Design a protein around this nucleic acid. Structure first.
Lengths: 102, 134, 59, 434, 176, 229
RNA sequence: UUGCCGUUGCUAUGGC
RNA sequence: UACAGUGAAACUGCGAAGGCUCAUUAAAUCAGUUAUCGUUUAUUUGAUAGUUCCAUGGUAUAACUGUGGUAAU
RNA sequence: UUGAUGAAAUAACUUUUCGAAUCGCAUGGCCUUGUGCUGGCGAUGGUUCAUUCAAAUUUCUGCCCUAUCAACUUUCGAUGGUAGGAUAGUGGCCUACCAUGGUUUCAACGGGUAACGGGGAAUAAGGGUUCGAUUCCGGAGAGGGAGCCUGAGAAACGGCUACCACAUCCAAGGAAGGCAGCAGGCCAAAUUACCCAAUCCUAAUUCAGGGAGGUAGUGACAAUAAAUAACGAUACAG
């Protein structure tokens, strides 16, 4: 099954955050399944599921592992305040559309 | 005359005298082990590459450690990659057989005239050579 | 699949060049937007028509 | 060194290295329990409980931060023991026998999810939280049993035709198991999650022995490649430590003015801290190895002595004693008791070595970590020692240990072992003190 | 339990001078909920001292820890519920003079947390809370009367019609 | 294009930030974007470094001063509130920008090399430093290249460390950006190759320029701390 | 103290 | 029932703040560097304003309306 | 024998600037019997000085051959003083008068290419030993010279006045921008679509932007590693 491993956990309280690198080990699976992985990270730490994000997923040749960048928050308010809009329209709840002209 | 700041006068160049022959001898006679990988994970495009060179795996270690040290994926900057990546894979597939490069034996670069035969401590007096021997 | 679009592009272009003189212009017009073809595509298609150097035949 | 000796980059990296977390599992702590000469030797309570199983194979033990051990036999039987009574024999809690009932009905590789063994359970490992034990052998399976029921709660195959597991090690204080499969493979499993993390390749003969400690590193050794590797499992890299004792040059070292010879096979490991380990070899060598040297720091040439010479009544079948004594060629065919079970108390000054020499040998490494010395001998275990480990009790200044070791009459992998000089099959328990 | 785990995760997340002060004073009062609930009065005196400090960078952790102490006791803050009201109003008015969105967020959050942990077991709530909210009732404020009235709504809808009737009869004589 | 002092690795991007107007120079300053972003890494990029500068955690020179290209140069006492990150920044031995951690005691002060003492208007004594600390009414013996001590709560010169014989020196200039030890010689010329020369572990002797130099303290007692290794 | 068989302890050993 | 939300046209604040072709300049181009008490300097940053005899100051003009000219801005 | 203040106050010009008509947090104090006195606090104001950045002048330092280039410089003053002008100011930078200066064989002045190449201008790339990364070729111009204006910065890429031509409208009276411009080609004439996410710049900004930057699509020069099958059985024939 899908197993997770955090490494190099640092605390950035200036952005009120804790950021780390994620080894995602999936044997005979398709790939990471980012949402289910975020639920697993929400479970392995304190919950904050709409405050946790992972973005830097790179699989390796032949499968097996993937390396990404995880960053858990406290306080979904500052998750909205600091996590940028493109990641928020990917995962969270902000959405911005533009008047495309010219 | 007068003093001018110069990063090229106290900069770590350190590549004008690194030769793979000398480093290969130092690695042979070091008596400290050398952190080889698991034996499958080093070949690249299911074999369509090489295995990969030693310069390649140290550069790759630097890229992934810089990656895990300041959180940034690189790019497809086209002028840079259209020179260096295609030239890198072309010299790799011409010279690197079995993961070991052999271009160092088919390229003119004088080993003694940059790597051995020290220059500052050249011992240009017989008193100096006797003292430095003893 | 823009891959299979490029593949059919190359196949139809070479097979067209075999039947006409080699160097014959194949002009790809995509799907229709609003009843007719895209105006940039029609612009440079008409630009190709705007110079063709018609040579006199016999009959 | 001057008055100004700072580097901006290095003080930056120490700023980040202060800022990070996990000063928890990465303890590169050397030997700190320097108790090699402090404890006694010649008054250990040597209780050998002979148990009714042909050819026991391995022992897993347990301490928390009640106490149970486990045994596993060539008669397909695990048996759990209570060892929490520190001055008597262990007691039987549950037997568990596999056999012909668990041969799969398919003869195909992925559906080897039968709930028992059928051939030669080879090693066993009890969890650091004690919830589970895991055991495996030549049925290319790892079976995880519960503690309180001894049910197989999961069966994970190694999934190839030569997937014999030969040694197991949980890393300390974690739920991650490293099993050294005979496919020149190391498989890693997460036992509370029941998953496989990493497979990792790289040995040259069958990976006969494994050992782990508090960090994610591991040390493995293969049989006849005569190299010992250690693995960074996050980085998936390894250091290779070859042997390298030449009998001709050791003869020259004695010939400066002597039956010591070459090396067949490295057998056993035990990692003593996160900067050294010790390997037991086929010519009775015990070698102590750093993390910064290929060749070993210290070699003890013969550790358990030399096998007895073959008898003149059983060498040829000629009539006269002169020719039957001629057919021994002198000292040319004397071979040593190969060290076949080695154990280190973690971060300690002592370690234990055992074979069919009849006496276990306790040794202590020197304080400078460049040599080691025989402390004493333990003459209460007649037979091959298939596993050694130690159980502790008591606080830092005063502590009492019981060496739990398993004794059989045949080696744990192939038989090969004749001249059973009155050996018995059971658990040797030596309580040493202070 | 989980009080020491939440406190240590908050300590591993955010830390400042007042967090250093609280951790140095009570490094042995994080786990063992029986012992911390025994010596909670010294924790309440240190909480009043850190509220007098009124630190901007170590506020949310200590305020949520005091709310977790009031929740983990749930009956034992009866004596220093008065000092809880006085210190929380003093720090909230200090942050009101500070005028920040995180300041108002933490103030309203701890008000709602103390109301959620204190609105269950109280049926003599209206007179006992109006005894300290008589100063909080009328202070020429656009927002503080709304904050008092919402908490009085939570204290009125969470008791009986006989209880709210006794409350209206008792607070009918302090009315006109 | 990017300067050597900031330890900008070549793996940065394309464009390097030109630091704006402020107290310090162009060549003798690293802005707060390259400070927080890729030197000690409290922010990852421009978006969140502007987010933390709009969250306003920083107290460089005891004030907030919210801008990315604010040229916080030599020994501007950086102070960040969340877990009391107190940093006085110096040069290392190769010209870069070291950041020595201090505490609140050392963060309650800093120094400044004087650059001129003039009699401008209304007879008021006058002293300006590298960070423009126009501070009022010293002793009249504020000499050339002397050093004043800044209170960092007020501006007042609380202590006065003289440029003269037998004081621990600093050098910002020459081929020698940032060495310490100052005792082989005082060779004072009248405008060129004029300096107090500096030692080494083998006590060598070096040549620098006069306004490219100031005094940090005394040989054997600087109270302005220096890192080690 | 077990697959048995024996010396047994009123607990140790030795033969498969 | 003196202003109240969308709101077609104007001013304002700001924006475009840096790119083609042709003849061939030898420390005069360019770089490093000293100085500018010989000097211009918006912006950033630090300081820095004491002369009153016998309840708050006038129209000119946009937008807005209205009449018109011109093929026409 | 050492130690110290220490070798802008006055008499006037001038079409002379201002001593708050900015906003916020705070009911708060004292009985002058009512906004009677309000009064604690912060940013922007605002003169001058300094600082940053930038601009222009200034001494010095930096690979061609150079004498069939040996004399140069007073033939846009040549070299210097004194004074005026104007400059941001010093300044023969222009003007009067005065001196006959000033350089060079220790190489003045004067003549080149591989000055599409060079000057460390600079990234270096762990073997390519001058190929190999980047700043600028020189200075202009917005049809051509001429004259004005704007602005912290301009002799404005995008402002005005007259002349000289190339040009479009046209009701033949009468208004302009400029496109005499640039991208293409002499059997590949389609790049000209998507974002400010990373970098950097401005910003009134817990917003907006930026064809600077970044991303995609065609445009073959047969330059590079695979496949188009592998493993059996049986029968028949010589």
């Amino acid at each position: 099954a899908v197993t997770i491993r955090t490494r190099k956990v640092i605390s950035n309280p200036l952005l009120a955050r804790k950021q780390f690198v994620v080894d995602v080990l999936h044997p005979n699976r398709a790939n990471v399944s980012k949402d289910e992985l975020r639920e697993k990270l929400a479970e392995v730490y304190k919950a904050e599921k709409d405050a946790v994000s992972v973005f830097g997923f790179r699989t390796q040749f032949g499968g097996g592992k993937s390396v990404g960048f995880g960053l858990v928050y406290n306080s979904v308010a500052e998750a909205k305040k600091f996590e940028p809009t493109y990641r928020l329209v990917r995962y969270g709840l902000a959405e911005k559309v533009e008047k495309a002209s010219r | 005359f007068e003093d001018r700041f110069d990063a090229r006068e106290h900069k770590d160049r350190s590549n004008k005298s690194r030769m793979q022959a000398m480093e290969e001898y130092i690695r042979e006679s070091s008596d400290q082990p050398d952190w080889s990988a698991s034996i499958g994970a080093d070949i690249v495009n299911h074999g369509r590459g090489g295995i990969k060179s030693l310069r390649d795996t140290e550069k790759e270690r630097r890229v992934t450690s810089f990656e895990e040290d300041n959180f940034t994926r690189l790019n497809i900057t086209n002028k840079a990659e259209k020179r260096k990546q295609k030239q890198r894979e072309r010299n790799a597939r011409m010279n690197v057989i079995g993961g070991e490069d052999f271009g160092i034996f088919s390229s003119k670069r004088k080993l003694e005239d940059s790597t051995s035969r020290r220059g500052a401590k050249k011992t240009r007096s017989a008193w100096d050579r006797a003292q430095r021997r003893l | 699949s823009q891959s299979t679009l490029r593949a059919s592009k190359k196949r139809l272009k070479h097979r067209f060049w075999t039947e006409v003189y080699q160097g014959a212009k194949l002009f790809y017009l995509s799907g229709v937007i609003n009843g007719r073809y895209p105006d940039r595509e029609i612009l440079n298609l008409s630009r190709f028509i705007s110079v063709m150097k018609f040579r006199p035949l016999k009959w | 060194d001057e008055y100004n000796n700072f580097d901006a980059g290095d003080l930056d990296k120490d700023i980040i290295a202060s800022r990070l977390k996990e000063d928890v599992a990465e303890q590169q702590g050397r030997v700190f329990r320097y108790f090699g000469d402090k404890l006694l030797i010649s008054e250990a309570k040597q209780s050998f409980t002979r148990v009714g199983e042909n050819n026991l194979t391995c022992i897993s033990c347990f301490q928390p931060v009640r106490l149970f051990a486990y045994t596993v036999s060539k008669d397909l039987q695990l048996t759990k023991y209570d060892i929490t009574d520190f001055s008597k024999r262990p007691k039987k809690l549950k037997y568990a026998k596999g056999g012909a009932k668990y041969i799969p009905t398919s003869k195909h590789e992925y559906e080897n999810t039968t709930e028992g063994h059928y051939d030669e359970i080879l090693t066993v490992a009890a969890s650091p939280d004690g919830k589970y034990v895991v055991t495996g052998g030549r049925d290319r399976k790892l079976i995880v049993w519960s503690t309180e029921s001894l049910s197989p709660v999961k069966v994970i195959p190694t999934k190839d035709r030569r997937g014999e597991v030969l040694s197991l090690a949980f890393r300390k204080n974690s739920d991650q198991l490293y099993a050294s499969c005979a496919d020149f493979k190391i498989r890693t499993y997460s036992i509370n999650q029941f998953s496989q993390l990493e497979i990792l390749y790289g040995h040259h003969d069958i990976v006969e022995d494994i050992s782990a400690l508090a960090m994610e590193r591991c040390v493995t050794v293969g049989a006849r490649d005569r190299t010992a590797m250690l693995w960074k499992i996050p980085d998936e890299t390894r250091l290779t430590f070859r042997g390298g004792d030449e009998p001709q040059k050791l003869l020259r070292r004695w010939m400066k003015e002597p039956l010591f010879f070459c090396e067949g096979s490295i057998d056993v490991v035990s990692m003593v801290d996160d900067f050294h380990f010790i390997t037991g070899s086929d010519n009775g060598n015990i070698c102590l190895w750093s993390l910064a040297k290929k060749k070993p720091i210290f070699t003890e040439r013969i550790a358990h002595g030399i096998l007895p010479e073959p008898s003149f009544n059983d060498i040829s079948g000629e009539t006269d004693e002169e020719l039957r004594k001629r057919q021994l060629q002198g000292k040319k065919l004397l071979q040593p008791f190969w060290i076949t079970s080695l154990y280190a108390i973690p971060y300690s000054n002592v370690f234990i070595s055992g074979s069919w020499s009849g006496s276990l040998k306790v040794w202590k490494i020197s304080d400078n970590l460049r040599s080691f010395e025989l402390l004493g001998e333990l003459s209460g275990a007649k037979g091959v020692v298939t596993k050694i480990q130690v159980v502790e009790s008591g606080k830092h200044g005063k502590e009492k240990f019981r060496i739990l070791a398993s004794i059989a009459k045949e080696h744990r992998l192939g038989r090969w072992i004749a001249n059973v000089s009155g050996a018995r099959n059971g658990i040797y328990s030596a309580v040493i003190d202070q | 339990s989980h009080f020491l785990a939440s406190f240590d995760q908050w300590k591993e997340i955010n830390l400042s001078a007042k967090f250093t002060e609280f951790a140095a004073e009570i490094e042995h009062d994080v786990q063992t909920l029986p012992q911390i609930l025994y010596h909670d009065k010294k924790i309440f005196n240190s909480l009043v001292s850190f509220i007098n400090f009124h630190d901007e960078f170590s506020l949310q952790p200590l305020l949520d820890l005091l709310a977790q102490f009031c929740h983990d006791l749930g009956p034992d803050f009866l004596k220093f519920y008065e000092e809880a009201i006085k210190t929380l109003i003093n720090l909230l008015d200090a942050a009101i003079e500070f005028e920040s969105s995180n300041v108002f967020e933490w103030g309203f959050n701890c008000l709602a947390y103390i109301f959620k942990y204190l609105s269950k077991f109280l049926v003599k709530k209206l007179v006992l809370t109006c005894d300290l909210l008589i100063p909080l009732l009328s202070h020429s404020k656009e927002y503080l009367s709304r904050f008092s009235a919402e908490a009085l709504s939570f204290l009125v809808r969470k008791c009986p019609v006989s209880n709210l009737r006794e409350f209206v009869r008792s607070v009918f004589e302090k009315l006109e | 294009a990017a300067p050597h002092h900031w330890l900008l690795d070549k793996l940065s991007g394309c464009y390097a930030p030109r630091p704006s107007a402020g107290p310090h120079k162009l060549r003798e300053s690293l802005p707060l974007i390259v400070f927080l972003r890729n030197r000690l890494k409290y922010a990852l990029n421009g978006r969140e470094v502007k987010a933390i500068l709009m969250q306003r955690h920083v107290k460089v020179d005891g004030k907030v001063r919210t801008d990315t290209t604010y040229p916080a140069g030599f020994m501007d006492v950086i102070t960040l509130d969340a877990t009391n990150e107190n940093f006085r920044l110096v040069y290392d031995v190769k010209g870069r920008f070291a950041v020595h951690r201090i505490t609140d005691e050392e963060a309650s002060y800093k120094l400044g090399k004087v650059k001129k003492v003039q009699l401008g208007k209304k007879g008021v004594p006058y002293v300006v430093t590298h960070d423009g600390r126009t501070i009022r009414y010293p002793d009249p013996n504020i000499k050339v290249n002397d050093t004043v001590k800044i209170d960092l709560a007020s501006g007042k010169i609380t202590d006065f460390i003289k440029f003269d014989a037998g004081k621990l020196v600093y050098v910002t200039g020459g081929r020698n950006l940032g060495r310490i030890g100052t005792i082989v010689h005082k060779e004072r010329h009248d405008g060129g190759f004029d300096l107090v020369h500096i030692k080494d572990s083998l006590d060598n002797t070096f040549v620098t320029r006069l306004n490219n130099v100031f005094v940090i303290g005394e040989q054997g007692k600087p109270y302005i701390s220096l890192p080690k290794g």
